[PDB]
Every structure is written in C-alpha cells, then in structure tokens.
Amino acid sequence: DAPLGYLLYRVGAVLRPEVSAALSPLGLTLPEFVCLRMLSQSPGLSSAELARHASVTPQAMNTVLRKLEDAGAVAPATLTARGRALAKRAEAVVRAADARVLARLTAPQQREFKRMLEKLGS
Amino acid sequence: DAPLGYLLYRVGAVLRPEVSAALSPLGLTLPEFVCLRMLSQSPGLSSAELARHASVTPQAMNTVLRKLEDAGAVAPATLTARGRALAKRAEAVVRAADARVLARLTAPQQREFKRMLEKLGS
Amino acid sequence: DAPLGYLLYRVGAVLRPEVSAALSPLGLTLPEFVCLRMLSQSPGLSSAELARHASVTPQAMNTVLRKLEDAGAVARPLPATLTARGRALAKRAEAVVRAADARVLARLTAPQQREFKRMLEKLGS
Amino acid sequence: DAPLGYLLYRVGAVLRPEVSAALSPLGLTLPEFVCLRMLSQSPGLSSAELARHASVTPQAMNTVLRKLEDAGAVAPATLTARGRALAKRAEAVVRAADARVLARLTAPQQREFKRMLEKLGS
DNA sequence: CGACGTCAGCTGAACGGCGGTCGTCGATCG
DNA sequence: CGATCGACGACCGCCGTTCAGCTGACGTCG
C-alpha cells in the first residue's frame, strides 16, 4: 500500500488542526502547550533543555517563555498556580481532540492502537 | 498517558532517520523520493500541483525537480526509464526501513495497525 | 525622423480624447456627432449611405440613429432627417468640437494654425 | 471649415493605401512593419510591452511575432540579420509613400509641415 | 437594401511565476 | 550558555499568460 510515513503524516494532518482549534479559545498555541506540559511534569528546568526536549531553537522557547511569563503562567523558570490550572484545562482539551480523532476506532481498538504506537517508539 | 501527537511524533522520530539512512546510498533525500513517487503514480503533473500535494513551496519542488532533471529522472514534467528504476529501488528501500521499525510488532499486529492508521487518516 | 503615419497618429492621439471629453457632457459620443453633422449638412440621407460616408457598418449607424430618434434629434419616417432640438444639439456640438480643436492647435501661433489647416486640407482633397 | 479630425482622417485615408501597396511586394503588412521598426529601434523588448507601445492586444502582436519568426526576422525577442535588412528596405518604401503624399506640398512646405505635426503631438 | 448565420477578435478572472521583504535558523565569539 | 552575524528559506505583492463569454464584422440570403 502506502509508505508508513505517509500514513503517520495523514493522521498528523487530521490531528493537528483539531488540537489547534481546541487550544485556541484557551489563548494557547501548540508549542506553548508543549512548554506548559513539560514544565508541569518536570518543574525547574532552564530554557535550553526545554528547547532540547521539544526539538526547537532556544530563541523559540524563549519567545514562548516570555508569552507565558507575561500571561502569569511561569515565574531556571517554573510554573505558578495559574499555570497549573491552565495546564490542566489544556491537557483536558487536547485529550478531547485526541478522543475526537480516535473516535473512528472502537474503544478496544483505541487501547490496543495506543499500545502499538507506544511500542513502535520507545 | 501521553498525548496522541507525542506518540505519533516519537514513531516519526524513529522512522525518519531510518528512511534517511536507507535512501542515502541511492543518492536520494526524502523530498526527492516524495517527488519521485508522486510522478511515478501520476505522470505529467506540473510543478505547482507537485508542490501542492507535498505541502511544500513551489521553489523547493523546483529545486528537487531540476536535481532530478540533472540525474536523468525527469524530462508539466514526467519520468524517464532511469527515473522508474530509481523509483522502484527507492520504494523497496523505504519499505525495508518500514519493516525494520514495524518489526517490534508481530505480523498480524503490523497489518492491523496499518489498517488502523489508514482509517484514522480521513 | 519618424514616418508620417506615426505623426498623424500622435496628433490624433492627442486630439481624440479631447473631443471625447468635450462631447461627453452633451450626452454625445464621437460617432453620434459624426452622424449629427452629416445630417446637418445633408438632410434626407438614408441609414445605408450614412454608414457609407462614415466608413462604418449599417448596423452601427442604425444603433446611433436609434439613439438619436429616442433623444428627439432625428425623424426617420429609409430617409432620416433632423429636428429642431437635433439642430441645436448639432450646433453646440460643433462649437465644443471646435473648442477641442483650438485647444490642441494652440501650441501653434494663429498664422501657423491657418497655414497648417490649409496644408492638411490640400494633402487630402 | 471642417473639423480637424476630418482633415487628419482624410490625409490618413490618402496615406494608408499607399503605404499598404508599398509594403505589399515586400511581404509585409502595416502591423508587421510597425513591429519590425519597433524592434529595429529597441531590440530585446518582450511581446507584452511591444503590444502595449503599439496600442494593440498581445495576441495580435504574438501573431505578428510568429509570422516574423517564420521568416527569420526575429528570435524577449530580438531582430536578425535578415530582419534588419528587411527593416531598412521597409523604412525606405514607406518613406517613398510618404514622399508621394507629401509631394502635393513644396519642399519647404513639407519641412515646415512636419515641424508642425511633431509639435502638435504632445 | 435589410437580415441572418458563421466566426474571428476583444475584454474580465483565475493560474503560474517572480521579484522585494523580513523572519528565522546554523556558526561563531565572549 | 546566551548573543550576534551572515544567509538560506518562506510569505506576498505585481507582471505575463490563458480561457471563458460575448459583442462586433463579413458573406449569404430573400
């Protein structure tokens, strides 16, 4: 059939607009959410390793970090209460987008599929 | 767990170096192979629609197209015999890379998983 | 220098927008004025021969003629002819076209103008 | 007397058949000579600006240009060795027609008259 | 002398192509 | 690790090109 990369690509092409439209009314972009979640799971890290874990340039991560400081999400930076709440609601919303693309599969199919994706990386 | 985009991303991050290392000793990059396969499936296409289908800018596609002209792969462009043979061998090697990443799954698991991706992609 | 046709052309290209912009606030185009003046000089002419004298097709001339009937300038019932309003319109049209003429010819002195017009009228004849 | 436009018209109506009969045994029409002379004075010009300077539509100018290509007159087109000579002889015959209409004026009258036309033309 | 069939020739719209413009990413030193 | 310099690459205006749609001009006619 079609190359594996093509299929991953098409699933990504379905997923990313949904995640974008979902994050949009929260005042968040996709990279900003990435940063949110990284700092929410690993508090305290500096900007450089943030950029290293998200495969972006330090300047992009600093732009994001300033947008999040100005928004009162972050204060060797770390998260604040507003940042935690924002992270929660963002997480929930992207999970909703996830459910909405994964809905073409039955629930068992979903579980097994996530196991398989989990395995193919690792 | 982890967001769907993260998992898709990690699988892509496993696959892309593999397809790169696979295409490398054929003198092909990944976009050049994309162009190859596109023209191999739909001969005659012009530069604009070539670029439209691969989600790239027309100038990138023109760079790729002239690089393929210089190699005697392409002649409203279309493929040559050398281009067809090259396309076949390329197909084969990226499919080998695919097999090599998909190998962590059993064969039935592989088939089922690819069915699942094919469905999840609209 | 440049061919005579080029020069005649450039003078025409200066003149025609002037006569057009001049005829415009009277509700007249250039062919309509041509027809007006023809009928003002030779009343009674038919649609066909009107078109023959202006080097245009009969259907175009009938278009202008229908416009001039609707405006109360001409009465056709082949042999068309002018009305009072049509003659007055023809008069002021004449005057305005003469004003455009004066405005392009003004780059020349008056004797130069007279002599030049003699010269053009001879080259045709 | 008669409106100025009538006079320009009558002189044009005398001149144009003469120029046509003059250009005819050279295998040239009037627009072809126009294009020829334009390229003879300004080599290199493209078809669009050629048509734009001659007050014609681009398709007419392209018709003329392909006719002059077939005759080995033109090659952003430009003139050829045959085209330059053809342009010279064309210039000459059109100049002869000019002389034939202008002959109704004395030579000083001719010179002064051409001074007057050039002045009246913006 | 009008009228109609036939069709070449002109105008408005979308496509492909290309410059000026600037944001953004590697490569250095501090 | 943060900063700057140098330059490749992506948006985006205008220009040339094309085709659809149609009003105009010849070549028959009663």
From Swiss-Prot, chain C:
Documented effect of changing R76Q: Abolishes binding to Rv0560c promoter
GO terms, biological process: regulation of DNA-templated transcription; response to stress
Phenotypic consequence of gene deletion: Mutation of the gene leads to derepression and increased expression of htm. Inactivation of the gene confers resistance to the imidazo[1,2-a]pyridine-4-carbonitrile-based agent MP-III-71, an effective antimycobacterial compound that shows no cross-resistance to existing antituberculosis drugs.
Regulation of activity: Binding of effector molecule SA, or its structural analog PAS, to the binding pocket of Rv2887 induces conformational change in its DNA binding domain, preventing binding to the promoter region of htm, triggering the expression of this SAM-dependent methyltransferase.
SMART domains from the UniProt entry: HTH_MARR
Entries under InterPro entries matching the protein: HTH_MarR-typ, MarR/SlyA-like, Tscrpt_reg_MarR-type_CS, WH-like_DNA-bd_sf, WH_DNA-bd_sf
Flavoprotein is among the record's keywords: no
HTH marR-type domain boundaries: 1-125
Domain notes: Conformational changes take place in the N-terminal and the winged-HTH (wHTH) domain on ligand or DNA binding. SA and PAS stabilize a conformation of Rv2887 incompatible with DNA binding. Rotation of the N-terminal plays a key role in the dimerization.
Record's protein name: HTH-type transcriptional repressor Rv2887
Species name: Mycobacterium tuberculosis (strain ATCC 25618 / H37Rv)
